[PDB]
Scaffold this active site. Structure first.
Site, PDB file in Angstrom:
ATOM      1  N   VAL A 287     -84.958  48.224 -30.228  1.00  0.00           N
ATOM      2  CA  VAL A 287     -84.702  48.484 -31.642  1.00  0.00           C
ATOM      3  C   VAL A 287     -84.525  49.976 -31.900  1.00  0.00           C
ATOM      4  O   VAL A 287     -83.708  50.376 -32.740  1.00  0.00           O
ATOM      5  CB  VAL A 287     -85.829  47.882 -32.497  1.00  0.00           C
ATOM      6  CG1 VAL A 287     -85.700  48.313 -33.952  1.00  0.00           C
ATOM      7  CG2 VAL A 287     -85.820  46.362 -32.382  1.00  0.00           C
ATOM      8  N   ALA A 288     -85.262  50.823 -31.179  1.00  0.00           N
ATOM      9  CA  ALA A 288     -85.199  52.261 -31.422  1.00  0.00           C
ATOM     10  C   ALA A 288     -83.949  52.905 -30.831  1.00  0.00           C
ATOM     11  O   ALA A 288     -83.441  53.879 -31.393  1.00  0.00           O
ATOM     12  CB  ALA A 288     -86.449  52.939 -30.863  1.00  0.00           C
ATOM     13  N   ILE A 290     -80.886  51.698 -30.519  1.00  0.00           N
ATOM     14  CA  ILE A 290     -79.674  51.374 -31.269  1.00  0.00           C
ATOM     15  C   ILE A 290     -79.872  51.829 -32.710  1.00  0.00           C
ATOM     16  O   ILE A 290     -80.872  51.445 -33.331  1.00  0.00           O
ATOM     17  CB  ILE A 290     -79.351  49.868 -31.215  1.00  0.00           C
ATOM     18  CG1 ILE A 290     -78.682  49.497 -29.889  1.00  0.00           C
ATOM     19  CG2 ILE A 290     -78.461  49.467 -32.383  1.00  0.00           C
ATOM     20  CD1 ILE A 290     -79.625  49.440 -28.715  1.00  0.00           C
ATOM     21  N   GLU A 292     -79.047  50.776 -35.870  1.00  0.00           N
ATOM     22  CA  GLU A 292     -78.426  49.634 -36.536  1.00  0.00           C
ATOM     23  C   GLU A 292     -77.830  49.984 -37.893  1.00  0.00           C
ATOM     24  O   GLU A 292     -77.070  49.178 -38.442  1.00  0.00           O
ATOM     25  CB  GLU A 292     -79.437  48.494 -36.699  1.00  0.00           C
ATOM     26  CG  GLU A 292     -80.800  48.937 -37.192  1.00  0.00           C
ATOM     27  CD  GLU A 292     -81.754  49.237 -36.055  1.00  0.00           C
ATOM     28  OE1 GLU A 292     -82.415  48.299 -35.566  1.00  0.00           O
ATOM     29  OE2 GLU A 292     -81.827  50.407 -35.636  1.00  0.00           O
ATOM     30  N   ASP A 334     -39.337  59.194 -41.428  1.00  0.00           N
ATOM     31  CA  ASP A 334     -38.060  58.603 -41.785  1.00  0.00           C
ATOM     32  C   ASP A 334     -37.239  59.617 -42.576  1.00  0.00           C
ATOM     33  O   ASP A 334     -37.786  60.477 -43.269  1.00  0.00           O
ATOM     34  CB  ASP A 334     -38.299  57.324 -42.598  1.00  0.00           C
ATOM     35  CG  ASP A 334     -37.021  56.667 -43.068  1.00  0.00           C
ATOM     36  OD1 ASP A 334     -36.228  56.195 -42.227  1.00  0.00           O
ATOM     37  OD2 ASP A 334     -36.830  56.594 -44.294  1.00  0.00           O
ATOM     38  N   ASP A 623     -40.108  54.414 -45.426  1.00  0.00           N
ATOM     39  CA  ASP A 623     -40.114  53.775 -46.745  1.00  0.00           C
ATOM     40  C   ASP A 623     -39.422  52.420 -46.821  1.00  0.00           C
ATOM     41  O   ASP A 623     -39.800  51.616 -47.667  1.00  0.00           O
ATOM     42  CB  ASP A 623     -39.478  54.688 -47.809  1.00  0.00           C
ATOM     43  CG  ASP A 623     -37.998  54.940 -47.585  1.00  0.00           C
ATOM     44  OD1 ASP A 623     -37.524  54.847 -46.434  1.00  0.00           O
ATOM     45  OD2 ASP A 623     -37.310  55.262 -48.581  1.00  0.00           O
ATOM     46  N   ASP A 627     -38.776  50.387 -41.041  1.00  0.00           N
ATOM     47  CA  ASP A 627     -39.894  51.166 -40.523  1.00  0.00           C
ATOM     48  C   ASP A 627     -41.145  50.341 -40.268  1.00  0.00           C
ATOM     49  O   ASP A 627     -42.043  50.820 -39.571  1.00  0.00           O
ATOM     50  CB  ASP A 627     -40.244  52.306 -41.491  1.00  0.00           C
ATOM     51  CG  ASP A 627     -39.211  53.410 -41.483  1.00  0.00           C
ATOM     52  OD1 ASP A 627     -38.827  53.852 -40.379  1.00  0.00           O
ATOM     53  OD2 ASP A 627     -38.774  53.828 -42.577  1.00  0.00           O
ATOM     54  N   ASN A 716     -84.999  53.198 -39.019  1.00  0.00           N
ATOM     55  CA  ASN A 716     -83.581  53.252 -38.679  1.00  0.00           C
ATOM     56  C   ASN A 716     -82.694  52.811 -39.842  1.00  0.00           C
ATOM     57  O   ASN A 716     -81.837  53.576 -40.303  1.00  0.00           O
ATOM     58  CB  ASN A 716     -83.310  52.395 -37.440  1.00  0.00           C
ATOM     59  CG  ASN A 716     -83.812  53.041 -36.164  1.00  0.00           C
ATOM     60  OD1 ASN A 716     -83.802  54.262 -36.027  1.00  0.00           O
ATOM     61  ND2 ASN A 716     -84.253  52.217 -35.218  1.00  0.00           N
ATOM     62  N   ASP A 720     -83.690  56.816 -42.372  1.00  0.00           N
ATOM     63  CA  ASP A 720     -82.701  57.827 -42.008  1.00  0.00           C
ATOM     64  C   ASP A 720     -81.294  57.498 -42.493  1.00  0.00           C
ATOM     65  O   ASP A 720     -80.391  58.345 -42.365  1.00  0.00           O
ATOM     66  CB  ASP A 720     -82.677  58.027 -40.492  1.00  0.00           C
ATOM     67  CG  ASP A 720     -83.717  59.020 -40.022  1.00  0.00           C
ATOM     68  OD1 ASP A 720     -84.571  59.420 -40.841  1.00  0.00           O
ATOM     69  OD2 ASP A 720     -83.677  59.410 -38.838  1.00  0.00           O
TER      70      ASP A 720
HETATM   71  F1  BEF Z   1     -34.069  57.277 -42.200  1.00  0.00           F
HETATM   72 BE1  BEF Z   1     -34.928  56.133 -42.780  1.00  0.00          BE
HETATM   73  F2  BEF Z   1     -34.780  54.908 -41.819  1.00  0.00           F
HETATM   74  F3  BEF Z   1     -34.489  55.817 -44.224  1.00  0.00           F
HETATM   75 MG   LIG Z   2     -35.784  55.391 -45.309  1.00  0.00          MG
END
Ligand code: BEF
Ligand SMILES: [Mg+2]
Length: 880
Positions: A287-288, A290, A292, A334, A623, A627, A716, A720
């Protein structure tokens, strides 16, 4: 698919299906072997493994064994507490990855069904799911494409392959056969699934259903859905194994030493007493050893992370993500919509007489000549700005009125003054667009086009008045400027008011000659106004930046040079160049890849995987839809605010304000969070080690073990647990940003912290042993209590010496951290509850415990932390 390499009518023979009609038997037969046009997630999500996968952690196995042994020892209470905290630590980690699942529903919404199809010779309409290869599908502008295929009749249609290529502009489609091996973005002779036909009509054959199509390829990369262990999780498990080995070493050691005491004992010894003593010692150490509370505390030090990020419009769905961004060394971004905002804007213009370096302020300010182009460019466009101000239309055309609104000139005050009723035909050939123009009492026919073709039918030039045509210095300067702008990868457009016809009923195709062109403009999708600093900031922070894009190489290579990602004389590669490059040489090229261009989705996930194999932990920011593979495969994914829901649900972090600065600011927080957990875990583990050093000494001298169960447990998970979090709340060092990225291979205590942990943990246990000796002289019951007082007080006061392994409490702001002092006082109270007359016997504190005994034990714990503080200054070490 290699169909774009094939011919038009040649494709229908390999499909063995007729282009004119598909019988009902063809539907039956082909559905039997190709299935429907549908995707369903292959996720069992049974949650049985997830409940069991928490036992794959060595930290939990030891506690299960210890609690089971605790049960048969008549110690029911101190065993049920272990079962409680084990379920707590389990419930954390199971739902930490339940939500970390790719929303295939979000991609399912783009199915785009009810597509016009020629069945049995009759034009009909059915759902997308009931479509199979060989069938003939009809496309009219405004609907989406059900599935990918090759068009055998192009009605001048333009589609938007945004979810594949990352560009949102309409690209022309040709029925002609391209006998060449080119990239995935320039499949001119065939269409793909999920794209919106912006313009024109068409017919096509569909090579594949929803499986083994391009969106199906993206779906497979998303179905893998394996995110690598975070630096914290990787380090923590690599040390949890080392920690678990100590328990099965020490249990054997105790089971051996207790048996050794039976040989030399007078009249032997009690055999069951030695065995049971070993078991009490064993559970006391398990117990000491680890902490927990470490899961319940790490989740809360991460509780600080995305809260500090929420004030900067950067959400984090998965907590362990925060620390990841700290250890990142390669940031892959991107191009369209991440570095930029996808808005098309003008950066420079070309007029025969006036070409200022910067565009002027307001139309009532520059007043240079007759702005004929400024008046006709808002008439030749087809873009609209709603009452909301949102963007609609072709993205190239909106750049004419967006840049106009920027210059204090409204988009309506000039479109309402002049009334145009033109034939507005298509641009199948020559990329021409005629209109009817009414100025004063005269007539005109404005026409816009590409600078390479619009000048072919050009027959007039004019600066500061009408100059009619010219041969020299006119046809050579237009090429000079258009070529220098195309060297800057600026999409240039030519516009000529063309007063060729006058008061005619309708404009004819023959009378489009004798064009008189006003001026040229260079529009380009410009980077964010906040990206240029995020690159110097990342380079000085030790982070290598890399751009992964799916657009043309000209704009992709131009962008980034200004930003400074690549060198002044560096080169990019195409996606075709990555389709043929194996893995053997790619890793030697991966350090000089700089910036990519015209890549496919699989190319993005490829680069992320390769960088991971290189040994650098990476991050992906994009975006669109193209991606999500790289996001789910990367250690953490960052999606844009305006990005589609696919990337938003497939990414760990989602920023909503498109402010790219917040990316670099994230790393600075990352390295901070880790740096606190490191000094938090240290504090929590050192106090554990000191509890072990005190137990083992009582075994080698055959004393009653200084601690009992339910006692160490309370220290524990309750006592603490407050100061560990308080240390988590420490301030960040200004030297954190310049420090090189923390390697994924170093240990948690690497960097001089390990020596501090052993120093403080030794001092704790040494003081505790001395207090147990004093109590042992008084009575056996006392020794337990005095040792416990020393432990629960020395671990409490250790916070001051554990605020920083390189500095003392004094001079580093003794009262600087309000949470540290709050925790020291609160733990003084959490110890005061032990001396209460009601809870005095549930902690094994005797009824003879007085204030003098407390004076002794507390002086020892105090002097222990005093030792720690003087030790910290002793040496020139601990500096990395
Ligand atoms: F260049 Be990202 F795929 F719009
Ligand atoms: Mg893009």
């Amino acid at each position: 698919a290699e169909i774009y390499r094939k011919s038009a009518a040649e494709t229908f023979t390999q499909l063995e299906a007729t282009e004119k009609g598909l019988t009902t038997s063809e539907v039956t037969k082909r559905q039997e072997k190709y299935g429907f046009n549908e995707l369903k997630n292959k996720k069992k999500d049974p949650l049985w493994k997830l409940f069991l996968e928490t036992f794959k952690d060595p930290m939990v196995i030891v506690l299960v064994i210890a609690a089971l042994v605790q049960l048969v020892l008549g110690e029911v209470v101190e065993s049920l507490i272990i079962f409680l905290v084990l379920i707590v630590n389990s419930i954390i980690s199971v739902v930490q990855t339940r939500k970390a699942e790719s929303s295939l529903d979000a991609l399912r919404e783009m199915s785009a069904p009810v597509a016009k199809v020629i069945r049995d010779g009759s034009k009909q309409s059915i759902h997308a799911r009931e479509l199979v290869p060989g069938d003939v599908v009809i496309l009219d502008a405004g609907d989406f494409v059900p599935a990918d295929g090759r068009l055998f009749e192009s009605g001048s249609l333009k589609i938007d392959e945004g979810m594949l290529t990352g560009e949102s502009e309409a690209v022309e489609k040709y029925i002609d056969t391209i006998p060449d091996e080119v990239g995935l973005g320039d499949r001119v002779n065939m269409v793909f699934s999920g794209s919106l036909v912006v313009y024109g009509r068409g017919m096509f054959v569909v090579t594949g259903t929803a499986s083994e199509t391009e969106i199906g390829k993206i779906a497979g990369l998303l179905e893998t859905a394996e995110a690598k262990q975070t630096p914290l999780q990787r380090k923590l498990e690599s040390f949890s194994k080392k920690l678990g080995l100590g328990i099965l070493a020490l249990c054997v050691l105790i089971f051996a030493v207790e048996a050794g005491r039976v040989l030399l004992g007078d009249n032997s010894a009690d055999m069951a007493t030695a065995i049971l003593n070993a078991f009490m010692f064993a559970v006391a150490v398990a117990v000491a050893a680890i902490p927990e509370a470490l899961s319940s505390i790490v989740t809360i030090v991460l509780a600080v992370g995305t809260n500090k990020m929420a004030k900067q419009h950067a959400i984090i769905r998965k907590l362990p993500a925060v620390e990841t961004l700290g250890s990142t060394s390669v940031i892959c971004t991107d191009k369209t919509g991440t570095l930029t905002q996808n808005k098309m804007t003008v950066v420079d213009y070309y007029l025969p007489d006036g070409t200022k370096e910067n565009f002027p302020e307001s139309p009532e300010n520059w007043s240079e000549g007759e702005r004929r182009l400024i008046h006709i460019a808002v008439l030749c466009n087809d873009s609209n700005i709603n009452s909301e101000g949102k963007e609609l239309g072709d993205p190239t055309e909106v750049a004419l009125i967006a840049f106009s609104n920027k210059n204090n000139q409204d988009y309506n005050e000039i479109r309402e003054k002049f009334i145009r009723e033109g034939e507005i035909p298509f641009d199948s050939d020559r990329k021409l667009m005629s209109t009817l123009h009414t100025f004063n009492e005269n007539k005109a026919m404005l026409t816009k086009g590409g600078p390479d073709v619009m000048f072919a039918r050009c027959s007039y030039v004019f600066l500061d008045g009408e100059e009619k045509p010219m041969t020299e210095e006119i046809l050579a300067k237009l090429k000079e400027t258009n070529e220098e702008f195309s060297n800057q990868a600026l999409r240039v457009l030519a516009y000529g008011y063309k007063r060729m016809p006058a008061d005619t009923t309708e404009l004819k195709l023959e009378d489009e000659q004798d064009i008189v062109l006003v001026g040229l403009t260079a529009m380009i999708d410009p980077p964010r106004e906040a990206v240029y600093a995020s690159i110097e900031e990342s380079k000085k922070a030790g982070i290598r930046t890399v751009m992964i894009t799916g657009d043309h190489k000209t704009t992709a290579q131009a962008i980034g040079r200004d930003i400074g990602l690549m060198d002044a004389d560096d080169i990019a590669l195409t996606g075709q160049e990555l389709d043929a490059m194996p893995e053997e040489e790619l890793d030697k090229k991966l350090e000089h890849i700089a910036v990519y261009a015209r890549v496919s989705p699989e190319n993005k996930i490829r680069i992320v995987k390769a960088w991971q194999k290189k040994g650098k932990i990476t991050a992906m920011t994009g975006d669109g839809v193209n991606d999500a593979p790289a996001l789910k495969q990367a250690d953490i994914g960052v999606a844009m605010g305006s990005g589609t829901d696919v990337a938003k649900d497939s990414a760990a972090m989602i920023l909503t304000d498109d402010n790219f600065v917040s990316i670099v600011d994230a790393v600075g927080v990352g390295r901070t969070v880790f740096d606190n957990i490191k000094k938090s875990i240290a504090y929590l583990f050192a106090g554990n080690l000191g509890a072990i050093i005190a137990i083992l000494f009582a075994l080698v001298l055959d004393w009653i073990n200084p601690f009992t169960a339910l006692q160490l447990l309370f220290i524990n998970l309750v006592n603490d647990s407050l100061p560990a979090i308080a240390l988590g709340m420490e301030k960040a060092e200004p030297d954190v940003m310049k420090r090189k990225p923390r390697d994924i291979n170093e240990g948690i205590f690497a960097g001089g912290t390990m020596r501090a942990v052993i120093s403080r943990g030794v001092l704790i246990g040494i003081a505790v042993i001395i207090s147990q000796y004093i109590g042992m002289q008084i009575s056996p019951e006392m020794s337990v209590a005095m040792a416990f007082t020393t432990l629960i007080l020395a671990r409490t006061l250790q916070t001051f010496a554990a605020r920083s392994n390189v500095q003392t409490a004094f001079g580093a702001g003794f009262f600087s951290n309000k949470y540290v002092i709050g925790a020291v006082l609160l733990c003084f109270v959490l110890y005061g509850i032990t001396v209460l007359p009601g809870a005095r016997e549930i902690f094994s504190i005797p009824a003879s415990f007085g204030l003098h005994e407390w004076s002794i034990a507390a002086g020892l714990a105090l002097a222990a932390v005093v030792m720690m503080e003087i030790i910290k200054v002793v040496q020139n070490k601990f500096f990395k």
